[PDB]
Nucleic acid binder design. Structure first.
Ligand SMILES: Nc1nc2c(ncn2[C@@H]2O[C@H](COP(=O)(O)OP(=O)(O)OP(=O)(O)O)[C@@H](O)[C@H]2O)c(=O)[nH]1
Ligand SMILES: Nc1nc2c(ncn2[C@@H]2O[C@H](COP(=O)(O)OP(=O)(O)OP(=O)(O)O)[C@@H](O)[C@H]2O)c(=O)[nH]1
Ligand SMILES: [Mg+2]
Ligand SMILES: [Mg+2]
Lengths: 171, 171
DNA sequence: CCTGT
DNA sequence: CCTG
């Protein structure tokens, strides 16, 4: 298996293009309340998880919930693309404020896999150019993650590696 | 600082070209008996740390010492280039034999930096082609380290990052 | 340096 | 999708 060690008090930041399987992954490995999703927050503020015009409010809400959880010492997983440094920056800062270990889990999957999954989705889709861009941003992000403040950086390089992941939570 | 978390029982594998500063780094961060060096082993078997013809015997000795230490539950740092997969393979296997966690620390420095340092050494030098080769092998190695069995993979991307390292030995 | 042979 |  692919064992990923994380401390009991972690902020797990999922990094991946739309279609890379972040939400599917989060549901398999974590409790529902441990996972806070940017799309869910778009729904919380606007009724519409697909409404990009409420992104600002959605991430304000996400960051707020993350802060409340870390204040209470609860492990939290951020289910958003997190492919822009500007998106990861405030998450690292919140983790620092509450002495929480930031962990990066990167879905380094081929653009074509994400595009294929997106084409076959029935829940929500994005345009092809979005996935092309997210994949490029994800790839450019990998080198600098440790320096950004991620204490553990785990890169998953194929669907096979994603499937094999087992988290080892250390108390 | 660049905080690198490692378990009390770790096999820390330094990965870097000649001239990348492995031995300097090892002395700064670890007690002498925690560090086992391939060049020191060349000296043990032949009187000459620079004798490349005794490489087989030197690594036999290094592996034997690593095995004894991990068996005794002692943190161990391997100071060798470790830029070939075939070199890392037995280290991972010995770690697994004794339920020890392998940690990779990669000196991902520009070839030019290593060459300049090499040029100014008075203790021992290698030819430029050696460093060019080591650097290429190091860079080609990075992606696959987690899959090889390294439970923690830390990549240092500049002399500034190397200098900033602080190990956090979790009990 | 896990060896330009 | 932190909005080409
Ligand atoms: N075959 C296969 N399909 C998967 C896997 N993971 C996710 N999928 C499918 O890919 C599609 C996208 O998966 P999601 O988990 O929603 O992807 P996401 O990264 O959360 O995408 P966004 O929310 O748009 O950012 C879904 O229809 C899944 O059923 C996988 O591991 N294997
Ligand atoms: N400026 C600077 N010089 C360094 C640093 N680390 C090592 N050096 C110099 O670079 C040269 C090589 O350093 P070593 O620690 O011996 O490098 P190594 O990786 O062990 O090299 P090999 O034993 O040949 O594989 C030495 O002369 C060091 O003094 C550093 O962090 N900063
Ligand atoms: Mg999702
Ligand atoms: Mg050395």
């Amino acid at each position: 298996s692919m064992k990923l060690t994380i401390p009991e008090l972690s902020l797990v930041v999922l990094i991946g293009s739309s279609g890379s399987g972040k939400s599917t992954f989060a549901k398999k490995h974590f409790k529902p309340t441990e996972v806070i999703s940017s799309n869910f927050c778009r729904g919380l503020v606007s009724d519409d998880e697909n409404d990009q015009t409420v992104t600002g409010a959605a991430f304000d809400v996400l960051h707020y919930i993350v802060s409340k959880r870390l204040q209470l010492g609860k492990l939290t997983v951020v289910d958003a693309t997190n492919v822009q440094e500007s998106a990861r920056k405030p998450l690292i800062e919140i983790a620092k404020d509450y002495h929480c270990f930031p962990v990066a889990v990167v879905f380094n999957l081929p653009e074509k896999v994400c595009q294929e999954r997106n084409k076959n989705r029935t829940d929500r889709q994005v345009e092809e150019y979005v996935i092309r861009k997210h994949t490029q941003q994800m790839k450019k992000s990998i080198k600098g993650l440790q320096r950004e403040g991620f204490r553990y950086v785990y890169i998953l390089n194929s669907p096979e590696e994603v499937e094999e992941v087992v988290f080892e939570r250390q108390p």
